Symmetry: C2
């Protein structure tokens, strides 16, 4: 709007948007899957459905919020360094989304053994690179 | 002077960011215990091994540690209305979390699953977001 940081809060602290909704979809999936183990009988097994559909929407919302950080970068400068931040986004997005198919489908054993914490971890690392090399940097250089 | 203040706000928004994010990590390792505690209605044993409950214990304590840094930074006066709010909203969202650590610690599956933790959580989000919005609206150095 005004220069950087006006366009950077709405941009990387709007990037903080995607990371909470992707983690949210993680909590919502393992509330869904625990109830799927209840299914052999009913007493509250019932919420499962609702949490899976509404797991799918937080990973949606993440996507769209990501779509502004994309449709907001005409930027680079930090360029291919934080291009990794943009690629591993896609990597976790993809994990979580398979975790929906799997669950959605009935495949619990890959649900449980698909190593989600790692695609996650990478993106922690990746946005966690960006803010460093935004913060100490466009100050030292502009 | 000038600078002083613009730099408390980033340490304070970072201590608050780390509390939130880390209290969220707690949610997910706790779920992962719960989830691996329901196994075939009642499986015989394990499911898997749930260290993950100890993991949730790690992450609660280290959420609560960046919030105890946050509570020892010099209070800007303007702000105090958002912080009172935040601390309410944080203390309760921490009790909520030790309570779920406990219901799991002692195998009370039906009471874990029963607690509205998403509600106390949501309460905190709208609080951190309102401190962050008030901050802009008060000290946004535009230009
Ligand atoms: N109290 C838990 C319920 C569940 O595990 O589904 C939550 O809201 O976090």
């Amino acid at each position: 709007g005004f220069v950087i940081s006006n366009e950077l809060r709405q941009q990387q602290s709007e990037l903080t948007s995607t990371w909470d909704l992707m983690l949210q979809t993680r909590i919502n999936l393992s509330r869904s899957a625990a109830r799927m183990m209840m299914d052999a009988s009913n007493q509250q097994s019932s919420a499962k459905t609702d949490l899976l559909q509404n797991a799918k929407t937080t990973l949606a919302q993440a996507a769209a919020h990501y779509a502004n950080f994309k449709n907001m970068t005409p930027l680079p400068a930090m360029a291919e360094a934080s291009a990794n931040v943009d690629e591993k986004y896609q990597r976790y997005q993809a994990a979580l989304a398979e975790l929906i198919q799997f669950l959605d489908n009935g495949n619990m054993d890959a649900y449980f053994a698909q190593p989600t914490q790692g695609m996650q971890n990478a993106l922690g690392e990746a946005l966690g690179n960006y803010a460093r090399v935004s913060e100490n940097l466009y100050r030292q250089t502009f």
